[PDB]
mmCIF file of C-alpha atoms and ligand atoms in Angstrom:
data_model
loop_
_atom_site.group_PDB
_atom_site.id
_atom_site.type_symbol
_atom_site.label_atom_id
_atom_site.label_comp_id
_atom_site.label_asym_id
_atom_site.label_seq_id
_atom_site.Cartn_x
_atom_site.Cartn_y
_atom_site.Cartn_z
ATOM 1 C CA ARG A 1 -1.730 -4.126 1.021
ATOM 2 C CA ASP A 2 -2.064 -1.423 -1.645
ATOM 3 C CA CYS A 3 -1.536 2.311 -0.935
ATOM 4 C CA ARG A 4 -2.906 3.467 -4.275
ATOM 5 C CA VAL A 5 -5.768 5.877 -3.812
ATOM 6 C CA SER A 6 -7.755 4.126 -6.451
ATOM 7 C CA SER A 7 -7.726 0.880 -4.550
ATOM 8 C CA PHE A 8 -9.186 2.273 -1.293
ATOM 9 C CA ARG A 9 -12.540 0.962 -0.142
ATOM 10 C CA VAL A 10 -15.305 3.475 0.576
ATOM 11 C CA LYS A 11 -18.676 3.215 2.360
ATOM 12 C CA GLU A 12 -21.063 0.948 0.441
ATOM 13 C CA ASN A 13 -24.405 2.467 -0.515
ATOM 14 C CA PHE A 14 -23.606 5.675 1.336
ATOM 15 C CA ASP A 15 -26.758 7.375 2.689
ATOM 16 C CA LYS A 16 -26.530 11.160 2.671
ATOM 17 C CA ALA A 17 -29.639 11.683 4.764
ATOM 18 C CA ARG A 18 -28.696 9.231 7.435
ATOM 19 C CA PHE A 19 -25.355 11.086 7.549
ATOM 20 C CA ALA A 20 -26.898 14.465 8.365
ATOM 21 C CA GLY A 21 -26.434 16.106 11.735
ATOM 22 C CA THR A 22 -23.590 17.069 14.017
ATOM 23 C CA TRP A 23 -20.249 15.402 13.817
ATOM 24 C CA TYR A 24 -17.425 16.022 16.287
ATOM 25 C CA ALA A 25 -13.858 15.694 15.134
ATOM 26 C CA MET A 26 -12.044 13.220 17.432
ATOM 27 C CA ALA A 27 -8.773 12.893 15.571
ATOM 28 C CA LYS A 28 -7.103 14.077 12.441
ATOM 29 C CA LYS A 29 -4.216 13.557 10.040
ATOM 30 C CA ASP A 30 -3.135 16.896 8.627
ATOM 31 C CA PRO A 31 -2.194 17.882 5.123
ATOM 32 C CA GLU A 32 0.529 20.237 4.023
ATOM 33 C CA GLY A 33 0.002 23.894 4.953
ATOM 34 C CA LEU A 34 -2.666 25.628 6.982
ATOM 35 C CA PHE A 35 -5.398 23.682 8.391
ATOM 36 C CA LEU A 36 -8.005 23.665 11.012
ATOM 37 C CA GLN A 37 -6.354 23.148 14.427
ATOM 38 C CA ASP A 38 -8.810 22.034 17.122
ATOM 39 C CA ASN A 39 -12.352 22.370 18.400
ATOM 40 C CA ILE A 40 -13.713 21.185 15.062
ATOM 41 C CA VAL A 41 -17.446 20.538 14.801
ATOM 42 C CA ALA A 42 -19.222 19.871 11.522
ATOM 43 C CA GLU A 43 -22.954 20.024 10.723
ATOM 44 C CA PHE A 44 -24.061 18.130 7.593
ATOM 45 C CA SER A 45 -27.313 18.832 5.703
ATOM 46 C CA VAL A 46 -29.137 17.482 2.705
ATOM 47 C CA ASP A 47 -31.897 19.309 0.849
ATOM 48 C CA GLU A 48 -35.097 17.947 -0.780
ATOM 49 C CA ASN A 49 -33.111 17.563 -4.026
ATOM 50 C CA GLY A 50 -30.434 15.393 -2.398
ATOM 51 C CA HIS A 51 -27.807 18.141 -2.425
ATOM 52 C CA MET A 52 -25.556 17.735 0.563
ATOM 53 C CA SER A 53 -23.866 20.651 2.225
ATOM 54 C CA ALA A 54 -22.089 21.346 5.467
ATOM 55 C CA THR A 55 -20.905 24.032 7.787
ATOM 56 C CA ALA A 56 -17.879 23.675 9.954
ATOM 57 C CA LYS A 57 -16.570 25.547 12.932
ATOM 58 C CA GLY A 58 -13.046 25.405 14.237
ATOM 59 C CA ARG A 59 -9.955 27.116 15.479
ATOM 60 C CA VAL A 60 -7.370 28.214 13.017
ATOM 61 C CA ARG A 61 -3.925 29.470 13.884
ATOM 62 C CA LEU A 62 -3.252 32.326 11.584
ATOM 63 C CA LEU A 63 0.217 32.436 10.157
ATOM 64 C CA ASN A 64 0.535 35.658 12.161
ATOM 65 C CA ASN A 65 -0.197 33.970 15.470
ATOM 66 C CA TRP A 66 -3.845 35.058 15.412
ATOM 67 C CA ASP A 67 -6.200 32.470 16.678
ATOM 68 C CA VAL A 68 -9.466 32.668 14.875
ATOM 69 C CA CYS A 69 -12.561 30.672 15.102
ATOM 70 C CA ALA A 70 -13.286 29.876 11.455
ATOM 71 C CA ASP A 71 -16.824 29.465 10.161
ATOM 72 C CA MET A 72 -16.678 27.315 7.008
ATOM 73 C CA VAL A 73 -19.149 26.281 4.359
ATOM 74 C CA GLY A 74 -18.924 23.390 1.974
ATOM 75 C CA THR A 75 -21.146 22.180 -0.825
ATOM 76 C CA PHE A 76 -20.875 18.643 -2.213
ATOM 77 C CA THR A 77 -21.288 17.366 -5.762
ATOM 78 C CA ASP A 78 -22.151 13.692 -6.244
ATOM 79 C CA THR A 79 -20.073 11.323 -8.344
ATOM 80 C CA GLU A 80 -20.527 7.877 -9.797
ATOM 81 C CA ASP A 81 -19.538 6.595 -6.392
ATOM 82 C CA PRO A 82 -22.100 7.356 -3.742
ATOM 83 C CA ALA A 83 -19.319 7.720 -1.128
ATOM 84 C CA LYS A 84 -16.997 10.051 -3.088
ATOM 85 C CA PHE A 85 -17.773 13.729 -3.470
ATOM 86 C CA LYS A 86 -16.176 16.852 -4.839
ATOM 87 C CA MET A 87 -16.356 19.552 -2.113
ATOM 88 C CA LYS A 88 -16.264 23.264 -2.773
ATOM 89 C CA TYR A 89 -15.549 25.242 0.363
ATOM 90 C CA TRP A 90 -15.132 28.838 1.546
ATOM 91 C CA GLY A 91 -15.242 30.770 4.796
ATOM 92 C CA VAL A 92 -17.644 33.413 6.051
ATOM 93 C CA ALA A 93 -14.511 35.458 6.560
ATOM 94 C CA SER A 94 -12.897 36.452 3.282
ATOM 95 C CA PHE A 95 -9.430 35.655 4.587
ATOM 96 C CA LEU A 96 -10.193 31.983 5.199
ATOM 97 C CA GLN A 97 -9.038 29.491 2.615
ATOM 98 C CA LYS A 98 -11.226 28.579 -0.376
ATOM 99 C CA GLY A 99 -10.817 25.551 -2.555
ATOM 100 C CA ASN A 100 -12.142 22.332 -3.958
ATOM 101 C CA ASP A 101 -11.219 18.987 -2.493
ATOM 102 C CA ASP A 102 -12.283 15.429 -2.995
ATOM 103 C CA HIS A 103 -14.232 14.202 0.064
ATOM 104 C CA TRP A 104 -14.573 10.469 0.544
ATOM 105 C CA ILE A 105 -16.557 8.724 3.278
ATOM 106 C CA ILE A 106 -14.354 5.751 4.027
ATOM 107 C CA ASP A 107 -16.651 4.192 6.575
ATOM 108 C CA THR A 108 -19.393 5.142 9.016
ATOM 109 C CA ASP A 109 -22.191 3.517 10.982
ATOM 110 C CA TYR A 110 -24.124 6.801 10.901
ATOM 111 C CA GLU A 111 -24.783 6.534 14.629
ATOM 112 C CA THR A 112 -21.334 6.525 16.202
ATOM 113 C CA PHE A 113 -18.369 7.170 14.014
ATOM 114 C CA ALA A 114 -17.191 8.352 10.665
ATOM 115 C CA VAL A 115 -13.880 8.172 8.784
ATOM 116 C CA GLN A 116 -13.255 10.770 6.095
ATOM 117 C CA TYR A 117 -10.334 11.190 3.679
ATOM 118 C CA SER A 118 -8.970 13.464 0.980
ATOM 119 C CA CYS A 119 -5.942 13.228 -1.258
ATOM 120 C CA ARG A 120 -5.006 16.674 -2.537
ATOM 121 C CA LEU A 121 -2.167 15.480 -4.644
ATOM 122 C CA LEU A 122 -1.391 12.216 -6.262
ATOM 123 C CA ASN A 123 2.078 10.799 -6.677
ATOM 124 C CA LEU A 124 3.076 9.403 -10.073
ATOM 125 C CA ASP A 125 2.591 5.895 -8.623
ATOM 126 C CA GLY A 126 -1.024 6.350 -7.629
ATOM 127 C CA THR A 127 -0.338 6.829 -3.958
ATOM 128 C CA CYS A 128 -1.193 10.083 -2.221
ATOM 129 C CA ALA A 129 1.397 12.889 -1.874
ATOM 130 C CA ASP A 130 -0.657 15.205 0.355
ATOM 131 C CA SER A 131 -3.647 13.949 2.292
ATOM 132 C CA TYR A 132 -5.953 14.725 5.191
ATOM 133 C CA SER A 133 -8.377 12.567 7.132
ATOM 134 C CA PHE A 134 -10.798 13.075 9.971
ATOM 135 C CA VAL A 135 -12.286 10.670 12.458
ATOM 136 C CA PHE A 136 -15.655 11.959 13.607
ATOM 137 C CA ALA A 137 -17.895 10.986 16.464
ATOM 138 C CA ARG A 138 -21.591 11.561 17.114
ATOM 139 C CA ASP A 139 -20.843 11.966 20.832
ATOM 140 C CA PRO A 140 -18.047 14.247 22.033
ATOM 141 C CA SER A 141 -17.124 11.638 24.582
ATOM 142 C CA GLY A 142 -15.968 9.314 21.849
ATOM 143 C CA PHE A 143 -16.411 5.663 20.942
ATOM 144 C CA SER A 144 -16.144 2.445 22.793
ATOM 145 C CA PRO A 145 -13.105 0.259 22.507
ATOM 146 C CA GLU A 146 -14.915 -1.909 20.022
ATOM 147 C CA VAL A 147 -15.392 0.986 17.611
ATOM 148 C CA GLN A 148 -11.901 2.174 18.280
ATOM 149 C CA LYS A 149 -10.797 -1.136 16.840
ATOM 150 C CA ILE A 150 -12.730 -0.627 13.663
ATOM 151 C CA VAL A 151 -11.383 2.893 13.209
ATOM 152 C CA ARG A 152 -7.776 1.702 13.604
ATOM 153 C CA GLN A 153 -8.354 -0.845 10.877
ATOM 154 C CA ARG A 154 -9.624 1.812 8.477
ATOM 155 C CA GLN A 155 -6.696 4.075 9.221
ATOM 156 C CA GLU A 156 -4.354 1.234 8.325
ATOM 157 C CA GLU A 157 -6.226 0.573 5.088
ATOM 158 C CA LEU A 158 -5.604 4.175 4.118
ATOM 159 C CA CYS A 159 -1.863 3.934 4.808
ATOM 160 C CA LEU A 160 -2.285 6.557 7.497
ATOM 161 C CA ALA A 161 -1.743 4.364 10.533
ATOM 162 C CA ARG A 162 -0.020 6.187 13.392
ATOM 163 C CA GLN A 163 -0.371 9.460 11.658
ATOM 164 C CA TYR A 164 -3.339 10.899 13.484
ATOM 165 C CA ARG A 165 -3.426 13.152 16.486
ATOM 166 C CA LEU A 166 -6.199 13.676 19.029
ATOM 167 C CA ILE A 167 -8.179 16.917 18.624
ATOM 168 C CA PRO A 168 -9.114 18.941 21.698
ATOM 169 C CA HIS A 169 -12.560 20.392 22.321
ATOM 170 C CA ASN A 170 -12.651 23.223 24.783
ATOM 171 C CA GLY A 171 -15.361 25.244 23.117
ATOM 172 C CA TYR A 172 -12.953 27.941 22.018
ATOM 173 C CA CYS A 173 -15.412 28.836 19.276
HETATM 174 C C1 ETR B 1 -5.697 30.654 7.321
HETATM 175 C C2 ETR B 1 -7.004 30.514 6.611
HETATM 176 N N1 ETR B 1 -7.605 29.362 7.507
HETATM 177 C C3 ETR B 1 -7.558 28.315 7.162
HETATM 178 O O1 ETR B 1 -6.468 27.688 6.587
HETATM 179 C C4 ETR B 1 -8.822 27.605 7.216
HETATM 180 C C5 ETR B 1 -8.809 26.568 6.722
HETATM 181 C C6 ETR B 1 -7.641 25.930 6.186
HETATM 182 C C7 ETR B 1 -9.964 25.768 6.671
HETATM 183 C C8 ETR B 1 -10.030 24.495 5.985
HETATM 184 C C9 ETR B 1 -11.364 24.033 6.195
HETATM 185 C C10 ETR B 1 -11.540 22.868 5.531
HETATM 186 C C11 ETR B 1 -10.812 22.012 4.502
HETATM 187 C C12 ETR B 1 -12.863 22.360 5.886
HETATM 188 C C13 ETR B 1 -13.189 21.230 5.202
HETATM 189 C C14 ETR B 1 -14.389 20.583 5.744
HETATM 190 C C15 ETR B 1 -15.473 21.405 5.585
HETATM 191 C C16 ETR B 1 -15.604 22.675 4.768
HETATM 192 C C17 ETR B 1 -16.812 21.112 6.256
HETATM 193 C C18 ETR B 1 -17.114 19.638 6.078
HETATM 194 C C19 ETR B 1 -16.004 18.799 6.699
HETATM 195 C C20 ETR B 1 -14.655 19.523 6.817
HETATM 196 C C21 ETR B 1 -14.018 18.382 6.057
HETATM 197 C C22 ETR B 1 -14.194 19.497 8.273
#
């Protein structure tokens, strides 16, 4: 299999606090329009109250050919599903995109990898018309082959197999 968003599995008993820290974007499936290009690094935090938030850094290619290092902020609201959040985001720079997107943690082991996903528009059939997904790593060097195998499985389960591209890290930001 099913490609309906509602049938997708998410991370069981997702732990916000164990998820905190630095996450390096290894690969990504882009959505329609503008997006972060490369050199993406995210820092997740959780306050005493259990409110998760994050800050992201990354290179954005302005429609005008400007390359900017974007500094982004996102706040997450919890839902009835511990692994599915509503994320409000904005940039430090007023010209960076602002919005609200679903943010689901598909899978993670907290120590090595993470698979994230967001459907910004649903088709009439329940499938996703415009999505994005990131594969994160704790270590910028990546994962082992064993983890690589888990990640591929998750990508397939999301109906996004073969749609990701490797993201370069050259500390542009
Ligand atoms: C031209 C304006 N520049 C842009 O077009 C800038 C854009 C899109 C930035 C989009 C940024 C987005 C969605 C960031 C989403 C996410 C975060 C906030 C931080 C947590 C994880 C993230 C999932 C990595």
